Design a protein around this ligand. Structure first.
Ligand SMILES: Nc1nc2c(ncn2[C@@H]2O[C@H](COP(=O)(O)OP(=O)(O)OP(=O)(O)O)[C@@H](O)[C@H]2O)c(=O)[nH]1
Ligand SMILES: [Mg+2]
Lengths: 51, 51, 297, 81, 154, 85, 146, 115, 55, 249, 157
């Protein structure tokens, strides 16, 4: 038993959805600590294509 | 709205064909994909800042 | 004209263009500068933009004179192979290997047709070896452009510099904005054959690089892969199919074996079995069973 | 040797879990309790939070046998040991 | 109207000094014409407000020449004469907007913000669901629920 | 300052089990409420050890870094010592 | 072109590309006591090998005379490899093991496992992947009969 | 000794807050709740949703979700109609004054959930 | 599918005391002391302008 | 206006259909043409059913089930305004309209006359006190649509602004079955109607009593008398791939 | 192109209800969704997430993604039914790549039909022989298509 995505705005509003409270986490953007403390191991270019 | 997800076996259809769920199970068999059971069908939110 | 579109086609276009960035087949069986057999990319890295630019003139002139020599000694080998030679019997057995051909049954290729197929591929090899040599004789120092693929071999490709800035206090008084940066030049070497003499020469350019300038090597080569339909067979789906309960968390280690699955190549003959009864039980031909078991009559 | 995510460690997860029950007796692992098993010794562990279903709390969810309240205002006067 | 909070009043010279940002914003000025055009009245102080501010924004990047000196105060007093005339027109349209939108709000049965006077319905400041439980300026306690200014059925 | 990254780390009735406590009740008790190996005895226990029934039943020594709890009761069971002080 | 060659009819030859990065230091980490872990750190970071093969090269005849990949085979292949197929080229990026030699072996068995399940479409129509049609709701003419 | 008493006192006030009846959380000035008691929304509440609102005791979160699932006036029942604020909807039944929200007890720790 | 029910609950309890018996298990997050300077003793805080992440 | 002699002409104009639907982009002359048709027809003293905007019926304030029609619904506030203005518009023709299939035992309070005309029937429906006007319109609209579908002699032009709203689902949804089932308490009833909202299937426009009488005259071929010159509306909100929140001012 | 608000207003001193100035957490902004993160008065873990700029921006990014989802699902007047390859029409007898795999494919350029296959919607009254072969009673009526060559009112006859 599953539910379709809603079509009205008040159903998205009144549904029991919690908001973000603590610091958000990503599965691969956590080795890099923050966007200000973005850690890079090797100084490759950002347009570097892997062969 | 709230419904039950259905499945049709190829032996039931008048023209048999491979369904999309057993192809998903075949894709999950090869690449070892974790299938979350309580993943809600209503919560399909795109990252619209990037996409 | 003018360009007006539906937005969801534009939403599909911009996502498909970035996700298919490195979905490119470099070594294609084709014409000149697009087509090749092996592709070498040497990414040169230095702290100043004129340091990597002057190195890219030093390495390209090195790889031009070396790359002309290795193609020329390959060109003298193709023109001897095109003048005449004897066909390999291992090559002749490779064409007469399939059971059913395109025309039904065994396609018996003779010594003329197999020698015709290598002649059709060596005629392609001459036109690709002459494309490298004629582009290696173009960049005279009077008029040279090593950034264009049609003029010089190899050509130098631009790559944007990695630049990362730092924002720190100069003391809560003021903020300093200094950036680490290093510049890149990529050298694309496309050879229509795999030669280890050029790979040895390409790897040894690290020993005479410029000051505070390093490099890394990219190698895109063609390699034959065998899909064994006996080790990896095409089987019907089982009677009781798998569900989502076999694909839970930590089911990648506890429920599934690694590919491939072991299938027994040994069997024991039962009581009343014959040569046609074991072949019926094994689902094979009786002549196929005797060929693997030629020891026992 | 696998590298990166835990999904690439098939044998090492298998070699750990067999080693986990190999050294551990069940006489030791029975004493570890969860949070709700400890909370059952409270006079009242369970009541609704005001996010979803706070209106379903009834007066029978209160442990009224372990306190004494005043007769005038209705607030709790004392606690029982 | 969904702006029902207590507000802070501003002098009218600080409103007009915004200019093209809020006072003479073109998206705001066009929907003030549609209020007067619906009621069938002339938009005469609104158009002459817009004609002045159309030409005021046209030269607003130009630097004035240095006034080298006059024996009599004639062009200085004349330039201030036209400048005080342009403010009195925009003072009228600032009053013409606040008069008409409160007259429209008395017709459409729409409740205003806190401490806002509508001449037909509530001569005093109508206060509804304030943080302060009493009247801010009349010193009377507010009842629960809010004061009904209109009749019931739509 | 970064958000809630300070190195140096209150009663509420409707948020009693969800303020300064674990997210889930199915999760086990932390490491501070169990004996890891052979010990000679600790001078203090940590403040993130959840008060159980055996804390008020036995009541031998409660040493919180100081705080010595000589008032055993049943209202403390189910939450750690951060909310008890 | 290196690689094994199968002459048996149960072995198909797939001409495929392999792209990899080899990087060696020559400025600071060329030789000292830090060269041991830095060169290993460069090899583990460059553990990726890209196994690329065109679907057009897979549409050849097998040893039994039948085609290796037909239309229904690549229709099953594009669904089993959703984002791994792009612009007619099946690309496999192997990143499981630290050394590139084991990633070529892990990439080869993942290609052969993907090809073997896509080859079920040659068995019958019951393994042909179904077409997903966005069929409309019943129209206003049919809704008038309600 | 008094912290155990104040915890049981705050938990008692939260449960009696959950049991007591509140005032109508909808504001009777705005559309469509402005209409008369014998037409419109109040007809649908009197004959279909009369026991549904009386059992949940007129708290603002259940009665808005009962307006969602009743379907015969949504989805514009919740967004178009202005509701009472959060501190105003927590007032008990028979409030009739603006001083009652500050009249409640400040000693308990119900985090704004006391009558 | 192989391990379900009581075999799952006893394995989770066996892996919990195996987690708790390891004296010295480094469960400290990385950002707690990722601000240590090597040339001087000046202590900064990661996230602000008193620290640079590359050097 | 004289259709019985020009019947083969009118059948060739509509290509045998019952009427015309006018479709185009947003903001063109769709509703501006539809108000001209009632100006053309009511000046030629023809009885006209004019729906000035279909979003009062489908996207209305509140929905109520029909009293005499099982499984059907009503827009009561849209119906009382429809039954009011249609009586005043064609009072010259509806007073001459004799009730053929209409029961004469209608409920009637003291001082009111039983309706003998179709003008008197519509004034019986909308002119009442609340809440007695809610069930009176459901009886009146059903008996109006029954009286119009039997008339084969007088031309009745039916003009609808926004027929595309009558061709798909109204924005109302069906009520949850727990509201009509009855409950003793909320804690033990196996329900979450006060806990989580959910989207029921949407009610189509064919289940409305007003559109039921319209679709009865359209599909049944025994009415070569009603001409449905209608149009559509494109008054929907814009959405071009992404959507934030609309600014209230 | 959409004219709705996407970003959150930044933090400054406490705004008042003035001309061109709304308070920072009001019921008008984002449809009243700022009541979860507002403060009425003019616990440390429950106070600082209301003032963090990255935290309040992420919640509006969720709410705008919810508004993007409900308008994309309200546009759907169709549903996806897995139809086998044999009973499918001629324009679906080709090899269809997945999403974001290839160039956006035209349907059939040979028949001068340049449109995306992924947005193709088929009417249900066309596929009654495929979707319902077991009924045999024609549950849906045939679609009445108007004659384009017939002289009607739009062609001045
Ligand atoms: N007087 C007059 N005005 C017209 C005429 N045609 C268009 N208009 C103007 O065009 C505007 C559009 O009118 P509508 O017919 O309501 O637009 P629409 O096509 O119905 O728009 P939607 O309801 O969103 O589909 C009106 O406001 C009129 O002012 C006309 O023939 N006469
Ligand atoms: Mg219109």
């Amino acid at each position: 038993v599953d539910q379709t995505p809603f079509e009205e705005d008040q159903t998205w509003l009144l549904h029991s959805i919690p908001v973000q409270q603590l610091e958000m986490h990503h599965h691969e953007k956590d080795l890099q600590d923050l966007p200000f403390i973005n850690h890079e191991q090797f100084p490759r270019s950002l347009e570097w294509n892997a062969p | 709205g709230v419904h039950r997800v259905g499945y049709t076996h190829p032996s039931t259809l008048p023209v048999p064909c491979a369904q999309r769920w057993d192809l998903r199970l075949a894709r999950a068999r090869i690449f070892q994909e974790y299938i979350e059971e309580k993943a809600p069908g209503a919560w399909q939110l795109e990252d619209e800042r990037s996409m | 004209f003018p360009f007006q579109w539906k937005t969801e086609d534009w939403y599909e276009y911009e996502v498909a263009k970035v996700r298919n960035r490195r979905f490119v087949f470099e070594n294609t069986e084709e014409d000149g500068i697009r087509g090749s057999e092996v592709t070498y990319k040497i990414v040169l890295e230095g702290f100043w933009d004129h340091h990597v630019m002057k190195l890219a003139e030093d390495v390209c002139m090195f790889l031009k004179d070396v790359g002309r020599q290795i193609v020329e000694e390959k060109l003298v080998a193709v023109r001897r192979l095109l003048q005449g030679g004897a066909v390999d019997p291992e090559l002749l057995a490779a064409f007469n290997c399939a059971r059913a051909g395109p025309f039904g049954g065994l396609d018996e290729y003779d010594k003329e047709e197999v020698a015709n197929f290598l002649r059709s591929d060596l005629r392609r090899l001459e036109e690709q070896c002459l494309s490298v040599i004629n582009r290696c004789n173009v960049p005279v120092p009077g008029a040279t452009n090593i950034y264009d693929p049609h003029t010089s071999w190899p050509h130098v490709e631009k790559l944007e510099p990695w630049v990362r800035m730092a924002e720190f206090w100069t003391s809560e008084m003021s903020t300093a904005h200094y950036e680490f940066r290093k510049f890149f030049r990529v050298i694309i070497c496309k050879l229509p054959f795999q030669s280890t003499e050029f790979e040895k020469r390409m790897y040894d350019i690290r020993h005479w690089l410029h000051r505070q300038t390093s490099c890394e090597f990219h190698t895109i080569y063609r390699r034959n892969v065998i899909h064994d339909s006996a080790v990896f067979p095409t089987e019907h789906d089982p009677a009781t199919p798998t569900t989502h309960e076999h694909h839970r968390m930590f089911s990648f280690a506890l429920d599934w074996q690694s590919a491939p699955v072991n299938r027994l190549s040994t069997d024991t003959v039962h009581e009343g079995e014959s040569w046609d009864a074991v072949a019926q039980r094994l689902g094979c031909s009786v002549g196929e069973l005797k060929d693997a078991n030629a020891e026992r009559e | 040797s696998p590298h990166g995510y835990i999904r690439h460690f098939e044998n090492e997860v298998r070699d750990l879990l067999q080693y986990v029950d190999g050294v551990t007796p069940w006489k030791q692992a029975q004493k570890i309790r969860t949070y709700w098993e400890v909370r059952s010794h409270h006079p009242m562990p369970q009541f609704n939070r005001p996010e979803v279903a706070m209106h379903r709390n009834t007066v029978g969810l209160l442990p009224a046998h372990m306190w004494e309240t005043d007769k005038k205002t209705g607030k709790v006067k004392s606690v029982k040991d | 109207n969904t702006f029902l909070t207590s507000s802070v009043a501003t002098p009218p010279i600080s409103v007009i000094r915004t200019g093209p940002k809020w006072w003479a914003h073109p998206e705001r000025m066009v929907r003030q014409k549609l209020m007067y055009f619906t009621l069938g009245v002339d938009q005469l102080p609104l158009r002459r407000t817009a004609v002045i501010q159309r030409d005021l924004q046209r030269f607003h990047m130009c630097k004035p020449p240095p006034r080298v000196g006059d024996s009599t105060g004639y062009k200085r007093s004349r330039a201030a004469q036209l400048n005080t005339w342009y403010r009195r027109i925009q003072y009228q349209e600032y009053h013409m907007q606040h008069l008409f939108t409160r007259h429209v709000w008395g017709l459409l049965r729409v409740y205003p913000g806190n401490t806002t006077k509508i001449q037909g319905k509530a001569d005093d400041g109508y206060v509804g669901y304030d943080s302060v439980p009493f009247h801010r300026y009349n010193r009377a306690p507010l009842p629960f629920p809010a004061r009904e200014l209109y009749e019931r059925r739509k | 300052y970064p958000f809630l990254r300070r190195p140096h780390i209150n009663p509420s009735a409707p948020y009693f089990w969800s303020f300064m406590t674990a997210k889930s009740q199915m999760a086990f008790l932390p490491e501070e409420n169990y004996i890891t190996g052979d010990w000679t005895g600790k001078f203090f226990v940590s403040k993130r050890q959840v008060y159980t029934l055996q804390h008020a039943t036995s009541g031998a020594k409660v040493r919180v870094k100081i705080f010595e709890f000589n008032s055993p009761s049943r209202w403390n069971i189910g939450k750690e010592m951060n909310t008890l002080t | 072109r290196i690689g094994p060659i199968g002459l048996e009819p149960h072995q198909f030859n797939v001409p495929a590309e392999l792209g990899f990065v080899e990087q060696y230091d020559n400025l600071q980490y060329k030789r000292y006591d830090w060269q041991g872990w830095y060169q290993r750190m460069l090899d583990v970071h460059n553990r990726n090998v890209s196994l690329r093969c065109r679907i057009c090269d897979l549409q050849r005849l097998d040893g039994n005379g039948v085609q290796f990949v037909d239309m229904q085979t690549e229709r099953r292949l594009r669904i089993l490899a959703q984002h791994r197929v792009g612009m007619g080229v099946l690309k496999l990026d192997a990143d499981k093991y630290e050394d590139q030699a084991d990633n070529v072996t892990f990439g080869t068995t993942k290609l052969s496992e993907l090809l073997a399940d896509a080859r079920k479409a040659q068995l019958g129509e019951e393994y042909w992947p179904s077409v997903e049609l966005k069929v409309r709701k019943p129209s206003g003419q049919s809704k008038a009969h309600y | 000794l008094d912290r155990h008493r104040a915890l049981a006192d705050s938990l008692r006030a939260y449960v009696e807050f959950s049991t007591s009846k509140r005032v109508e959380p909808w504001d009777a000035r705005f559309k469509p709740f402005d209409r008369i008691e014998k037409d419109g929304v109040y007809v649908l509440m009197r004959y279909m949703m009369e026991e549904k609102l009386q059992l949940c005791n007129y708290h603002h979160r259940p009665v808005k979700r009962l307006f969602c699932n009743i379907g015969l006036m949504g989805p514009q029942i919740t967004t178009k109609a202005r509701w009472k604020p959060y501190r105003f909807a927590t007032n008990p039944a028979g409030t009739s004054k603006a001083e009652r929200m500050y009249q409640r007890d400040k000693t308990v720790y119900t985090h704004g959930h006391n009558d | 599918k192989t391990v379900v029910g009581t075999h799952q609950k006893m394995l989770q309890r066996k892996v919990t005391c195996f987690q708790y018996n390891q004296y010295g298990l480094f469960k400290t997050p990385y950002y707690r002391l990722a601000n240590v300077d090597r040339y001087h003793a000046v202590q900064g805080v990661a996230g602000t302008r008193e620290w640079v992440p590359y050097v | 206006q004289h259709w019985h002699t020009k019947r083969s002409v009118l059948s060739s104009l509509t290509n045998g259909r019952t009427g015309f639907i006018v479709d185009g982009p947003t903001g063109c002359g769709k509703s501006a043409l539809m108000c001209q048709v009632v100006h053309f027809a009511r000046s030629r003293n023809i009885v006209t059913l004019y729906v000035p905007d279909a979003k009062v019926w489908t996207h209305g304030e509140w929905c109520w089930p029909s009293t005499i029609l099982p499984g059907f619904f009503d827009a009561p506030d849209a119906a009382r305004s429809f039954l009011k203005y249609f009586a005043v518009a064609n009072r010259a023709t509806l007073t001459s309209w004799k009730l053929r299939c209409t029961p004469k035992d209608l409920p009637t309070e003291q001082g009111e006359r039983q309706p003998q005309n179709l003008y008197e029937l519509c004034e019986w429906g909308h002119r009442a006190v609340a809440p007695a006007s809610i069930d009176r319109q459901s009886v009146c609209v059903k008996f109006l649509m029954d009286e119009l579908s039997e008339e084969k002699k007088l031309p009745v032009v039916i003009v609808v602004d926004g027929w595309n709203l009558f061709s798909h689902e109204t924005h109302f949804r069906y009520p949850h079955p727990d509201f009509l089932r009855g409950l003793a308490s909320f804690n033990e009833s196996s329900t979450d109607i006060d806990l989580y909202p959910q989207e029921l299937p949407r009610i189509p426009a064919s289940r409305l009593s007003f559109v039921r009488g319209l679709n009865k005259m359209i599909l049944s071929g025994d009415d070569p008398n009603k001409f449905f010159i209608t149009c559509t509306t494109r008054d929907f909100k814009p959405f071009d791939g992404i959507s934030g929140f609309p600014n209230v001012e | 192109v959409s004219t709705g608000e996407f970003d959150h207003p930044p933090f400054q001193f406490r705004q008042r209800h003035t001309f061109n100035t709304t308070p920072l957490h009001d019921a008008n902004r984002f449809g009243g969704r700022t009541a979860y993160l507002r403060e009425i008065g003019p616990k440390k873990q429950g106070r600082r997430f209301k003032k963090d700029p990255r935290t309040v921006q992420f919640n509006v990014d969720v709410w705008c993604a919810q508004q993007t989802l409900r308008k994309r699902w309200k546009q759907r007047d169709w549903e996806v039914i897995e139809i086998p390859f044999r009973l499918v029409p001629r324009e679906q007898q080709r090899v269809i790549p997945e999403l974001y795999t290839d160039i956006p494919q035209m349907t059939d350029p040979a028949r001068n039909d340049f449109s995306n296959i992924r947005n193709k919607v088929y009417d249900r009254e066309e596929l009654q022989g495929v979707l319902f072969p077991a009924a045999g009673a024609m549950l849906y009526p045939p679609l009445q298509r108007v004659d384009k060559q017939a002289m009607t009112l739009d062609k001045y006859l």
